[PDB]
Design a protein around this ligand. Structure first.
Ligand SMILES: Cc1cc(=O)[nH]c2cc(-c3ccc(C(=O)O)cc3Cl)ccc12
Ligand SMILES: [Zn+2]
Length: 208
């Protein structure tokens, strides 16, 4: 029962979501290997993802976390890129989407930097790039990211040199320690702690 509603570029909701995507682009230490070389995106569309069942599943978990955490869900809006984006908007996040080899544990990963999530749209490491051209820096093919509502609850703070959550925690916060430009990443262990609120379709832009 998911329906996608197109936002008009003239709508303030479109404009705030586009500004979060654009303003959280950073340079990556791979020189663009995984996600391509760019400083900004061309946003083609932003759709609101509406699924009553998935939304209730998310608010039900959010109330349980918030009750375990002095009435504080610690809810954030974060990006998630994956080849499974079509399945996530219809069926929700789940364990099948956990990153088994993730540095901060086997869970589902979200990013503050949209350009970190862009690195994963075509798979771990950028996979083989776009399906059409096999190009991880393709400027033609349309990519998609989710901008998601995520319940962190009590988050374990892991400093990083760039399964279940640690006992008594509802998530993990991956704090960069070496690149003072990198924003945080977060990992959750139950799919019902994230709701894919917006589906953003875009291209990366070749720098001038
Ligand atoms: C760090 C991070 C940020 C993000 O926005 N998205 C991701 C997605 C995956 C991921 C996990 C499993 C698989 C697969 O089973 O094939 C694929 C991917 Cl892309 C892993 C990590 C991230
Ligand atoms: Zn392509």
């Amino acid at each position: 029962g998911t329906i996608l509603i197109d936002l008009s570029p003239d709508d303030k909701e479109f404009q705030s979501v586009e500004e979060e995507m654009q303003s959280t682009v950073r340079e990556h230490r791979d020189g663009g290997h995984a996600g391509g070389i760019f400083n900004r995106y061309n946003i083609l569309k932003i759709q609101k993802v509406c699924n009553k069942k998935l939304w209730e599943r998310y608010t039900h978990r959010r109330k349980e976390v918030s009750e375990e955490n002095h009435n504080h869900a610690n809810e954030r809006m974060l990006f998630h890129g994956s080849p499974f984006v079509n399945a996530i908007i219809h069926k929700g996040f789940d364990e099948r989407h956990a990153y088994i080899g993730g540095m901060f544990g086997a869970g589902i990963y979200f990013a503050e930097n949209s350009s970190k999530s862009n690195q994963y749209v075509y798979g771990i490491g950028g996979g083989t790039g776009c399906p059409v051209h096999k190009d991880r820096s393709c400027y033609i093919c349309h990519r998609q990211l989710l901008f998601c509502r995520v319940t962190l609850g009590k988050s374990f703070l892991q400093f990083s040199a760039m399964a279940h959550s640690p006992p008594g925690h509802h998530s993990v916060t991956g704090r960069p320690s070496v690149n003072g430009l990198a924003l945080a990443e977060y990992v959750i262990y139950r799919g019902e702690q994230a709701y894919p609120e917006y589906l953003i379709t875009y291209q990366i832009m070749r720098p001038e």
